[PDB]
């Protein structure tokens, strides 16, 4: 529904429609299907309305897991809820988990906070366990959209699991 996406339209199908439908073609190549895609740029441009419209084409379950979500004062349920979502996503192949503003998750601890927020580093345990912990297989689409990040290296970057790195054109 938005013009100028022709560059991404070729990158979306191969990273979304192919691994959830045509992934058998990757078996003929000999590589595992991509487990996700990285996004760059502020939300609202080819991110919110675009990704939600792709799930209708692939007929998959669209689940919103953001960086500012699952935020509460009980220690350990944040990663525990992450464990329950991806566990159910392994049984149902047509599932899509979109991540908006991953820099909230990608942030690490530069200081000891004592009380209040200790949860900065816990939410990366179960997120990486279901991605970097296991082998390469796609039972779900994990789309990580990076808003603003500079010195943060959670290891979510690089083609370890997710495949394409998409940056919104500034021109």
């Amino acid at each position: 529904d938005v013009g100028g996406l022709d560059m991404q339209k070729q990158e979306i199908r191969e990273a979304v429609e192919l691994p959830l439908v045509q992934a058998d073609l990757y078996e003929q190549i000999g590589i595992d299907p991509p487990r996700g895609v990285l996004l760059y740029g502020p939300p609202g441009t080819g991110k919110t309305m675009l990704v939600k419209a792709v799930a209708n084409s692939t007929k998959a379950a669209f689940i919103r897991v953001n960086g500012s979500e699952f935020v509460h004062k009980y220690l350990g349920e944040g990663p525990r809820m992450v464990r329950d979502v991806f566990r159910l996503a392994r049984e149902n192949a047509p599932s899509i988990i979109f991540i908006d503003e991953v820099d909230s998750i990608a942030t690490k601890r530069f200081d000891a906070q004592t009380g209040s927020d200790r949860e900065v580093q816990r939410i990366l345990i179960e997120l990486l366990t279901q991605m970097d912990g296991f082998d390469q297989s796609t039972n779900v689409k994990v789309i990580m959209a990076t808003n603003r990040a500079d010195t943060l290296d959670p290891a979510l970057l690089r083609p370890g699991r997710l495949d394409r790195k998409i940056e919104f054109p500034s021109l």
């Binding site: 191969e14 192919l18 073609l25 990757y26 003929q28 190549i29 000999g30 590589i31 595992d32 991509p34 004062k73 009980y74 220690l75 350990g76 349920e77 990663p79 525990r80 464990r83 690490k108 601890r109 200081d111 000891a112 906070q113 004592t114 927020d117 200790r118 949860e119 900065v120 580093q121 816990r122 990366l124 345990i125 179960e126 990486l128 366990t129 970097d132 912990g133 296991f134 082998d135 390469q136 290296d153 959670p154 290891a155 970057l157 690089r158 083609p159 370890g160 495949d163 790195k165």
Partner: protein, 338 residues
């Protein structure tokens, strides 16, 4: 006939035997309730009940019902002990020193404990993984338990640490009691791993509390339990938030460092994917290794994924050599950034 018998059963719980009484009773601890003296069943021996023995008690009359097999089975969050999972040294391998150091630190003491006992020396029960980011040793941990016919145990600090009082303790004591009978196994701990495969870079506030109730119970295996064949696989690139005294024996014994992915090391790594991948004729895998510098294990799987993308545009099940030159050019600029 079995319908009326099973469907009318009120149900029965599980409890641990505390002590035996000469009056033909027994004291069994109940988790939702507490220690309660019940009556020994007519088909169950009162003398055969030992301390911490797993038995079944009926919830109707609140007495002894049956006796189960003795094992440690507390609340399980990612604690389930598996056997020979799916992994291999071929996929996560490709380096000579990487696999060779595993044989000495792991394979020798676990399979043949009499080698170190014949010389009157201790055997390493732990290892610390090293090397630059993008190793892939996380899946290698499953290969250690698969090929050695041992039991794989994954310890995730996220599920064992909760805000409720005692969760940083009980959940750690669950691993302590489980490791007594299940000792012939392999334990892998999370949240400490800096090596770049699964990297949380430690935790400042998460490891500032439970560090006291965790490391003390792990050292009691050799001091108190005195149980062997227990392998603790830990990985960190730096010691900061954890105990600086972990360098003592019984916790950190041997240290295996991941060699730099040189040309000779990455030459066999490209031969790993080429077995599963479909390639054409005339492709030089050694020349591709010379085109990059310091390519990690994550970038090798990335450039092979990029090479498969150009093959889909050509509608060919095989990846031509022309697609590799286009794939290597993309991974070099991708690895150069940040």
């Amino acid at each position: 006939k079995d319908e009326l018998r099973l469907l009318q059963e009120p149900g029965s719980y599980v409890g641990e035997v505390i002590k035996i009484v000469s009056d033909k009773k027994v004291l069994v601890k109940v988790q939702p309730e507490g220690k309660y003296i019940v009556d020994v069943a007519k088909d169950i021996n009162v003398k055969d009940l030992k301390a911490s023995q797993r038995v079944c008690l009926r919830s109707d009359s609140y007495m002894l019902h049956k006796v189960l097999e003795n094992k440690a089975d507390p609340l399980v969050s990612l604690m389930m002990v598996e056997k020979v999972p799916d992994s291999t040294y071929d996929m996560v391998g490709g380096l000579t020193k990487q696999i060779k150091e595993i044989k000495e630190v792991i394979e020798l003491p676990v399979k043949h404990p009499e080698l170190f006992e014949s010389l009157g020396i201790a055997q390493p029960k732990g290892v610390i993984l090293y090397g630059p980011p993008g190793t892939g040793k996380t899946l290698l941990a499953r290969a250690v338990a698969h090929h050695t016919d041992c039991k794989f145990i994954r310890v995730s600090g996220a599920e064992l640490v909760q805000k409720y009082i005692g969760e940083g303790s009980r959940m750690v004591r669950e691993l302590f009691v489980m490791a007594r009978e299940h000792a012939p196994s392999i334990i892998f701990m999370d949240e400490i791993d800096s090596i770049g495969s699964t990297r949380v870079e430690g935790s400042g506030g998460g490891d500032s509390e439970v560090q006291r109730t965790m490391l003390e119970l792990l050292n009691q295996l050799d001091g108190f339990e005195t149980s062997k064949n227990i392998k603790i696989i830990m990985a960190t690139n730096r010691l900061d938030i954890l105990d600086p005294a972990l360098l003592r024996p019984g916790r950190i014994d041997r240290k295996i460092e991941f060699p730099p992915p040189s040309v000779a090391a990455r030459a066999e790594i490209l031969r790993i994917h080429s077995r599963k991948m479909n390639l054409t004729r005339g492709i030089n895998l050694r020349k591709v290794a010379e085109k990059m510098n310091g390519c990690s294990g994550a970038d090798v799987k990335g450039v092979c994924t990029e090479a498969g993308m150009y093959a889909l545009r050509e509608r060919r099940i095989h990846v031509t050599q022309e697609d590799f030159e286009l794939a290597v050019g993309k991974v070099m600029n991708k690895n150069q950034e940040t």
